[PDB]
Structure formats: C-alpha cells, structure tokens
Amino acid sequence: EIPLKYGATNEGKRQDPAMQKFRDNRLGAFIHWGLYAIPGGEWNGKVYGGAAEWLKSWAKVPADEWLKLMDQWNPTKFDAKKWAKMAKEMGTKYVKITTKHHEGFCLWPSKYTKYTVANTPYKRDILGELVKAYNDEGIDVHFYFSVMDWSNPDYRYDIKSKEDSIAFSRFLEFTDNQLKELATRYPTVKDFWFDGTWDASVKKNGWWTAHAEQMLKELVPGVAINSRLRADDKGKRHFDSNGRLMGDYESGYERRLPDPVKDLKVTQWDWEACMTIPENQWGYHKDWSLSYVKTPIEVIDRIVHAVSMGGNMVVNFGPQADGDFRPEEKAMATAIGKWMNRYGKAVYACDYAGFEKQDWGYYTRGKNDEVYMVVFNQPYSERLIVKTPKGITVEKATLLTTGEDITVVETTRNEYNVSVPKKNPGEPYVIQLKVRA
Numbered sequence: 001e002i003p004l005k006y007g008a009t010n011e012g013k014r015q016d017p018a019m020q021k022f023r024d025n026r027l028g029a030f031i032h033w034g035l036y037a038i039p040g041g042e043w044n045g046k047v048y049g050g051a052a053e054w055l056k057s058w059a060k061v062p063a064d065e066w067l068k069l070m071d072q073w074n075p076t077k078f079d080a081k082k083w084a085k086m087a088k089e090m091g092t093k094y095v096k097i098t099t100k101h102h103e104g105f106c107l108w109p110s111k112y113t114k115y116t117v118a119n120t121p122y123k124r125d126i127l128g129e130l131v132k133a134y135n136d137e138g139i140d141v142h143f144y145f146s147v148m149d150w151s152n153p154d155y156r157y158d159i160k161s162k163e164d165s166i167a168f169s170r171f172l173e174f175t176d177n178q179l180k181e182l183a184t185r186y187p188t189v190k191d192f193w194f195d196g197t198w199d200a201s202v203k204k205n206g207w208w209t210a211h212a213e214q215m216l217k218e219l220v221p222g223v224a225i226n227s228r229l230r231a232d233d234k235g236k237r238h239f240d241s242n243g244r245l246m247g248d249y250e251s252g253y254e255r256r257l258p259d260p261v262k263d264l265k266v267t268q269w270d271w272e273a274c275m276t277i278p279e280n281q282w283g284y285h286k287d288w289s290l291s292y293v294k295t296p297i298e299v300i301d302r303i304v305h306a307v308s309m310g311g312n313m314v315v316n317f318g319p320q321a322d323g324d325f326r327p328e329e330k331a332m333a334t335a336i337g338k339w340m341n342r343y344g345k346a347v348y349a350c351d352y353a354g355f356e357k358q359d360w361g362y363y364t365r366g367k368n369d370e371v372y373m374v375v376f377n378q379p380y381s382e383r384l385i386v387k388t389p390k391g392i393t394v395e396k397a398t399l400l401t402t403g404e405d406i407t408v409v410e411t412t413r414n415e416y417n418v419s420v421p422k423k424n425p426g427e428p429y430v431i432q433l434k435v436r437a
C-alpha cells in the first residue's frame, strides 16, 4: 500500500448503536432551501433550465447582488410542525437539511457572517425550528454543508499564490468556526453531509478534511460523516489512494444507483444515495415542465433498489420561497407514505439479502432473517422465480398485507417458483419468505 497520514479512517462498517440507527432508518428526505428559492430558476425574465440552486452561476450574478435576495426572505407560510408532520406521514425516518448551500446563505443565525436568516425580514432561526420540530416527531436530523462558499471573499478554487494560501487558510478557519457552531447549537445532529469539496483548493488540503471529520466526531458522540468530505494525502477523494473508503459511508450515488448485478461491492460498506424528483432540480424551480418528472412508483423503485443493495435513499424536496411545498412534492410524500404504511416492513431496518437479482423486482433481508420479495414487474407467467444461495431453502411464502399463504413449488436445485397472489395487488407488493439454513 501507499502510506498516508490522511487516508482511510477505520476498517469496515461501524456497528455502534448510532450507525445502526443511521442504517436502519433507510429512508430520509432532503431539504434544499436557500435564497435560490426566491427567483426559482429565473433571473430578470429569463428562465434557466439548469438546476435552480446553481442560478447565480447560470445567470452570472455577482455575490453582492445574489445575496440581496435576503431582503426578500420572508417565508410567511413556513410552519416547522407541519413540515415535520408531512415527513412523519411520508414515513421518512430522517431529514437532511441544507444548512448552507453553495451560495453561502445560512439557515441558522451564524455569528461568523452577515449572510444568514437573522438579517432578513423573517429573522427567525429556520434550522433550529426544523431541528426541534423533526425531533419532536422522533425524526433524526442531518446537516448538509457546502464547503464551497460563493459568499466568502476568502474562498479560492485553486491555490495559485501566497495570497491564495493566506486567504484559504483563513477560509478553513471560518469553515471550522461554522462547523463547531452547528455542532454546539444543535447537539442532536446525527450527520454532516459535506458537499462542494471537489475544487483543487480542497484536494490540496486533504489534511483539513480528516481534521474536520475528527473534530466533529469529538464534538458529537456518534455523529456520522460522509465520504464526500474526505481527500487523502495525494488528493484522491471518497476512496483513498489505497482504495479504502474514507468517512463513515459512501455518498457518490447522486441521481444514479449501482447496478444490482454488477456492483455488489457496495454491500461491503455503508452508503447513501440521494435523488431529485425531476431530472436535475434540487432547489425550488418554478417550471417543472422543463424536464422529466418522476412518478411515485419510479421513486419507490429507487428506494427499494437502494435498500436491496445495503443502502439508504434520500428523496429531495425544494421548498417554495413562501415556506410551503409545491403540490407535486406533497403528492409524492403522500403517495410514498401510503406505500410505506403497507410495505415498510420490507424497508425499515432491512439490508442486502445475498440472493441473485431477478426481473420481477428486489429482495430485502429483515432483522430476523426474513426475506422480502418486493415485486415491481408482474410476470405474465404468474410465477416469480427465486434462486436461493447454496444451502438456503424456502419453507413458506406469505402475502405481507393479508397473511395469505402463497404456493411455493420447487423447480430445480436451489430454485423455486413463488406464485403471484390470486388477486393482483394493482401496485408494487411484498411477499415475505421464511427461509431456513
């Protein structure tokens, strides 16, 4: 191996109770809310099709001008209790919130910059109210944090001069100050999800990513820290120069997912995927007709996909300027919530099952060695093929919702045909298998 002072931290999966809760949660929501929600992907009568949270860049607005949006920040319909009820109803077990996105505007009243929720007509600590409200519903809260900060004059994209070095060094101190602040103001935080860490400035300072991770783990017992934060001695990100995962879990699956046949490597480490509802919109964009919008079944497929391969899935929402959610998102959360009420036993606290992928859908494995078949593609043959691993036998199949026995017929060695239900469920459904070893 190449030796490294700032390479991979521990060996494999954490199995302390905090990581087990992070894992067993499985389904979370993402909240991208910032000044970008005001223009909503439109600058001066020109609608941009790019991601709305990147409008400063699309429309080339200077920092000074972009941040004046603060003067319009007055989410009059915001009600954190309602945000939390909505999440509880969706069956989301955790919410990851943009504390500060690339624009640099903070959703908590930071004492280290003026660009925060304090210096707005609304004044209030949005982050704090959300933390309290989600926690009151027994929902964990995670903090998204963009290292790249377009509002701080000391940020640099690359270290070209002594000047740059003096500035960036001060920037990392600034960054540290905000991180300790979030950690000490909101100690129930369970995770820092770092973003905007890909610039050469950060790659050349791998030492600081390890320090960031280490400092937060001391400030917050059991906190989880994502791989995206981390660079090693040689500038390699996520995985270190010897191929070891840095941070507590892998977080590169953004609007994509690992192949359920070819990428089974992911089962060896914790990981978390995040997804948008449209093609590429994280912040609120006012014109969702500009790209394909995923239906509820398409999002549900991706949730179960992730869990079947040992991962979490986080569904993103981009709240409106006014503090409400658009009706597309409300319909999504309600549709997901209804499905999770019926079928969530096959999601919460589940994991990779070790069975070869089949066309009808996905397997998941429960805490007590239950094996769930989650069927998305209904075979006309009316037979669901199950190939067991060597030594596993199938005792029984039960329709989860009704308890009805489902016929299991042996077809060859380590292979069965599990019948479809007598009555078509009319939606993705679960058959729960009792397996013996």
Ligand SMILES: C[C@@H]1NC[C@@H](O)[C@H](O)[C@@H]1O
Pocket: 051, 053, 054, 195, 254, 274, 282
């Ligand atoms: C989750 C995504 N991470 C990349 C960032 O540039 C996007 O705006 C989103 O925050």
